Amino acid sequence: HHHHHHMQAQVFRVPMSNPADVSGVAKLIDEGVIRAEEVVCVLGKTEGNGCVNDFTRGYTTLAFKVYFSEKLGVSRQEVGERIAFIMSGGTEGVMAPHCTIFTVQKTDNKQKTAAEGKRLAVQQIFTREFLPEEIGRMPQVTETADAVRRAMREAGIADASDVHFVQVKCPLLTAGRMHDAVERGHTVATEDTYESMGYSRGASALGIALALGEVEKANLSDEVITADYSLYSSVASTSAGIELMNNEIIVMGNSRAWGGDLVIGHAEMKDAIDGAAVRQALRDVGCCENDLPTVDELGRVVNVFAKAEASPDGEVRNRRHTMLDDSDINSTRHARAVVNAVIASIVGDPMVYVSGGSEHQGPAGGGPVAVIARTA
Amino acid sequence: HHHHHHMQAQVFRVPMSNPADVSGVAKLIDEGVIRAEEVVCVLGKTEGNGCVNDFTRGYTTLAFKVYFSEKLGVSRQEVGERIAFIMSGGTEGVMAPHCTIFTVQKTDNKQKTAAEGKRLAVQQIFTREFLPEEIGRMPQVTETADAVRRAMREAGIADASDVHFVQVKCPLLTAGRMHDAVERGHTVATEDTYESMGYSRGASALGIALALGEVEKANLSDEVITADYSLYSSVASTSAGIELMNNEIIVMGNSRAWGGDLVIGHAEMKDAIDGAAVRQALRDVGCCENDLPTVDELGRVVNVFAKAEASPDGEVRNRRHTMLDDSDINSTRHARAVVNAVIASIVGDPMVYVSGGSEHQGPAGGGPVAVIARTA
Amino acid sequence: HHHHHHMQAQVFRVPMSNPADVSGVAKLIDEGVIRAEEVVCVLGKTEGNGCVNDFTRGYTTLAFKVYFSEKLGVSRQEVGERIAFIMSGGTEGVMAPHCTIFTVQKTDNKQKTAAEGKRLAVQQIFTREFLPEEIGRMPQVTETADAVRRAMREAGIADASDVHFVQVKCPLLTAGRMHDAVERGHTVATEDTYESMGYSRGASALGIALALGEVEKANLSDEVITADYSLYSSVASTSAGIELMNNEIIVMGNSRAWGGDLVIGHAEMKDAIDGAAVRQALRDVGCCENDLPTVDELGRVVNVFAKAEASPDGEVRNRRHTMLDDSDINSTRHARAVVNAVIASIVGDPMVYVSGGSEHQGPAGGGPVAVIARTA
Amino acid sequence: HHHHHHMQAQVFRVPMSNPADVSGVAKLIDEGVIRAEEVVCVLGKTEGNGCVNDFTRGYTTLAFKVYFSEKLGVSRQEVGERIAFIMSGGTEGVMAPHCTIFTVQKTDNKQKTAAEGKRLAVQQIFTREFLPEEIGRMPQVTETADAVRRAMREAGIADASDVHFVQVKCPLLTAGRMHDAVERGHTVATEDTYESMGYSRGASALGIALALGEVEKANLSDEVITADYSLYSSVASTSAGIELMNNEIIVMGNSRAWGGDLVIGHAEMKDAIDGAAVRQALRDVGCCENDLPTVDELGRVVNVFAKAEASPDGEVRNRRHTMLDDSDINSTRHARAVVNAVIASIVGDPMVYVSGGSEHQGPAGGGPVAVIARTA
Ligand SMILES: [Mg+2]
Ligand SMILES: [Mg+2]
Ligand SMILES: [Mg+2]
Ligand SMILES: [Mg+2]
């Protein structure tokens, strides 16, 4: 009598022709490949500049809320409370705009499984609203950690070693939110909006590290954040956006309690040109058995997800880089172009998720790379 | 009684801390590693934007003319007539600013050679001055071709199959030069300066193709240039600059008439993420015997030289890219970041020469990649 | 027995905090200052880069269609067929993002007028859909002209001398639309998307000139467009956008058949720093009686509307400018920053509409400046 | 028996076609309009991006050192110790690249004066070298102040009310200089290079304010700098550059001890569109007797010199501006385009000096505007 599962994850990498193009998703729903009701996350690469004044993130979010609210017959607020819309801007270099759709299929009666291994589990969860004076600070850290521990448990992911990627959409500090904080008698972690994105990304990432036991609580405080880059998560991927003031989190790992045919793995890029780490992540998901991946192996890849940054020590493999003191082009623009190019050249596909700004996500100048792949 | 050589090439990849930093070169001359009198080409990657208003190209040129004129006790004009100063702007992504010094050692009495194979030959040559109405048109094509055929012969490179890289510094059309042409009763190939860079690069590249028998003269005319991308050289690398109105050419290949321990090889990148072509060029120079290069093999690499461009069909491996309709960041900026990232991740060194704009240099969206490497 | 009017225009300059901020408009409707049913045009300054990949134009359009469709209880398609959403990107320099709401109040029984003069008349009209091979060419010219003549008549604007500003939203050629045209056996006026914006703006502007008798039909053909800048309209203001393939036109002038207290006037800026033309337009609407406008006079200004461009001869008042060969910053970005700065410094308010790219709109390097002002 | 003078200043506004174009200056020397030996300052507007990676500043400096060293028969080091080469990058909007040449003619026997008034006095002076840990801090403040007080005295400028413009070239902190400071056991005022430019500009400006009695010493400390913008000089204009580690200062005012026909005046722009302050500065130098300047009056203007910045409160005349959270275009780029446009439209000439970044120079969001003009 076969083994059985109540839960199954599906993942779909969908090309987008511009920030408002929901048609690849509508096609899959129209064709019954996915059910709108089972979507839990839309993870976008939108082709704005990926920095402060990137409005394609909110544009794409709005475009998807309109589609899903009308497809599901609910309000835009409800759909927003039901699906995490996580839009990472900046599609530099060859990086192809797209979105990844995550679905969870829950069956009241179990459906039989064919292989005994663990399979992809994903669980979305939202934190409480933060006040602006909490952004970039320990209340964002610990609330995120609490949410991550909870999502793990509810997904039936056994322990932190089975978590391979935690994606967060986190707030940033606009000038208005800063004023709000001051007018109420508080300070903010920084008075520059662009810098606030790294603070928000960093604090969220350390929450993940805290939740997975990768850092000790007693080594964390406000003054560590964006400062002590010996502290980090190996699976954290955080993306700052203008819209919300809470954190939207999707935990991704493997679990025996899930059926289906997707698994996930990860490695740690030690820097932005560490293609060996890329091949190792592929290998862990059975997509690079030898030195170089084969075409069949690469056809199992659903998508690759990575974080990129300009090495803050100014160097890559003891060569000076120019990404940090370039007044025309922000460092994250450079960094995303690089890391997507490295991954694209290994998996032969520029349509992969690469998000900039990896404060406390991997080592400095590096970041996590995760692969979701089919088992056959 | 050993075989013998009159000619020997040396090549030195020198870090630069900013566009005026000649100190790495001064160090090698001060230490007697090279002789100022035997330098024939300084090939720079200067950290300006690499497009029209990139003044680091002329800055670096000026800085080197001052150093060499004073080191050689000649005027800046004479040093400029003696050394080709070929400055390719744009050091995007991880690309590390640097210059490559080429020297030719001529000995009246031959010096004995140890291995019988062909060795790196390089030969600099300048064309006549062009009028602005000749830029981007058949007189730039045929003069370049004549110069390339001559440089080959004088270098003792047996035939086109032994040429692996032809580097050109070519003019561009400023608004003043355009007016000059009109006031004299002529037209120009384009009235936009940035577009004129592709016309100048393209015409120069087809001269190289003509010289090496890669295209037929009867298939060339003005209307082909930047238009028919089925016509191209596999070894051409051309870089437009504001300074001169002639073409400065350095032909690089292998020859039995040269001693030393450097060889060169090349492959054709079919697109900007074609790392297999990169590994093939390494393999041809004995630096990638198996699937992945080893650390010893990579230590033989002196430098890698490549051309990069945004695929003009809008696509990379059937994925849409955004490089061509990005009003904030020029396509060549994107493309250089990509191709240097791909090469850097394979050879483990971001200090490599990657020049943007590959009209008629490789297939559309692609370009040549050449490696100069030590034989042991 | 007083004179009487069936028609009255209102205009409201509304600050926007970001591209999706419809709240200033919702406030005026909630308060009953305007009636949603009487809005005919939303003219936006959205804070994207104002060039090809400016997605705030469509974002803002989408945000307003959602608000109005839900306020009016119609579909987004119907609201789009009822209101012209004309979004001009690029808010450089001090230029403050905002929108201008235009309303037309029609009364079946006339309402009495107090002053006998002409008053602001505005009339929206849409052309037919264009095929991509018509963009930038005589069918866009003549269809626009037909639409302008019709809007004038239906508005009861007596003749071209009473037209002071014709605002158009016109298409641009994406790579897909170009392919469509070729696959059907046709050519396009240009194969570059950014250049296609000037072609679309130019053709639309000459339609306006044709309609108002400012150019002769026999002097127009495809080869004139973006080429012969002695041909132009003094009241045309055209803005290219990615969304539609028709032209949306709003004609603005003065008419005895309209009541209310708004008038409009215009002058022609001879170049981008022609503040005397700005003061002349103010004077024509009674807002600059002496050399310098007073605070009361400036308080009558509802908004100012202007076109800006980088002088294509490379010069402003016989000084070289750098706007055209700047690879980091598009010329229209520079030009909008300049012209808004000049106007803002004269009217003491950076919240004014300045749209880039004035092909055939005013003389080369110049453009129209119109003022809508209250009569007291 | 006439009054008499030992000292006379000349000023020449010279167009430049590119950063290396010294020919307008060579022409004036060749023609004997100026004597190379009497040049004390070359004040440039060079057409780089005016931020961190603007290499046209050093390029232009190098180009002028080569010309003058060879014209004067001295070394480049000596010419650099003899002339202040003050290169302000960024020629945005219509701003025309150019340099202003300042000369001082000293005569052992006095030359008779025709008018009794004060005339332009200018005095160059260099501070000591700073260590990087002194940049942006009180030792830069007080050394600058000492140098300013000394230059004033040696120029015979009676008191601070006769000083109208103090131009400084000040250092910035590269990553290397920061490391130097840390390795020696010290901190730096900031670890970002771009931010270090404002710290260096700010500290230098407060030195000027200290020297002229515009701020009290007891209100200054390190923590005030870039923080308390109620502290500022009304005549300070400071420009950060990569080259030196000292400050090069030129004090400009009026003095009875100077002959000639140039005077200088200044006003304080309260914000970036304060054209009334521009007209007031003109009026003080007899170039705007009525509301609007006349053509003859404007022909007396040799040049105008101003500082520009993006209002750090996010607003201009209670309108939101976008200059500070624009990741594509630095705020100083925007601000320079604006202020040069405002001045150009008033004096009818875009060739004027406008330098970005006015920390402690005028009120926040504003800056000084000075005019040097002929008396007839
Ligand atoms: Mg990291
Ligand atoms: Mg090519
Ligand atoms: Mg025009
Ligand atoms: Mg200030």
Residue numbers in the entry:
A (entry chain A), B (entry chain A), C (entry chain A), D (entry chain A): -5 to 370
Provide the authors' own sentences about this structure as they appear in the paper.
Cyanuric acid hydrolases are members of a protein family containing only themselves and the barbiturase enzymes, they are found only in microorganisms, and are present in approximately 0.3% of sequenced prokaryotic genomes. The enzyme is proposed to catalyze an opening of the s-triazine ring via a nucleophilic serine residue that is activated by a nearby lysine, a mechanistic motif known as a serine-lysine dyad. TrzD is a 370 amino acid, ~39.5 kDa protein that exhibits a complex α/β structure characteristic of the cyanuric acid hydrolase family enzyme. The three structurally homologous domains form a pseudo-three-fold internal symmetry in the TrzD monomer.
The product-bound structure was refined to a resolution of 2.19 Å, with Rwork and Rfree values of 0.15 and 0.20, respectively, yielding high quality electron density maps. An examination of the active site revealed, unexpectedly, the active site lysine residue in domain 2 (Lys163), that in other structures paired with the proposed nucleophilic serine, exhibited a significant displacement out of the active site, and opening a clear channel from the buried active site to the protein surface. Moreover, the difference Fourier map (Fo − Fc) clearly showed electron density corresponding to two CO2 molecules and Lys163 within the TrzD structure. As expected, since CO2 is a co-product, one is located in the active site, while the second one was observed at the interface of domain 2 and 3, proposed here as the exit channel for product release. The CO2 molecule is stabilized by H-bonds with the side chain oxygen of Ser82, Ser233 and Ser349 (~2.9 Å), and the backbone amide nitrogen of Gly350 (3.3 Å), backbone carbonyl oxygen of Gly83 and also with a side chain nitrogen of Arg330. The oxygen atoms of the CO2 molecule were stabilized by two paired H-bonds with the side chains of Arg51 and Glu237 from domain 1 and domain 2, respectively, with additional stabilization by the hydrophobic residue Ile236 backbone amide N and Glu237 backbone amide N. The present structure has an Mg+2 bound and makes 6-contacts with neighboring residues and one with a solvent molecule (2.8 Å). In the TrzD structure uniquely, Lys163, which is conserved in all cyanuric acid hydrolases, was re-oriented toward the surface, opening up an exposed channel between the domain 1 and 2 interface. Here we propose this to be the product exit channel. In silico, carbon dioxide remained bound, thus revealing the exit channel. By this model, domain 2 lysine’s role in catalysis is not limited to activating catalytic serine to open the ring but also guides products towards the exit channel.
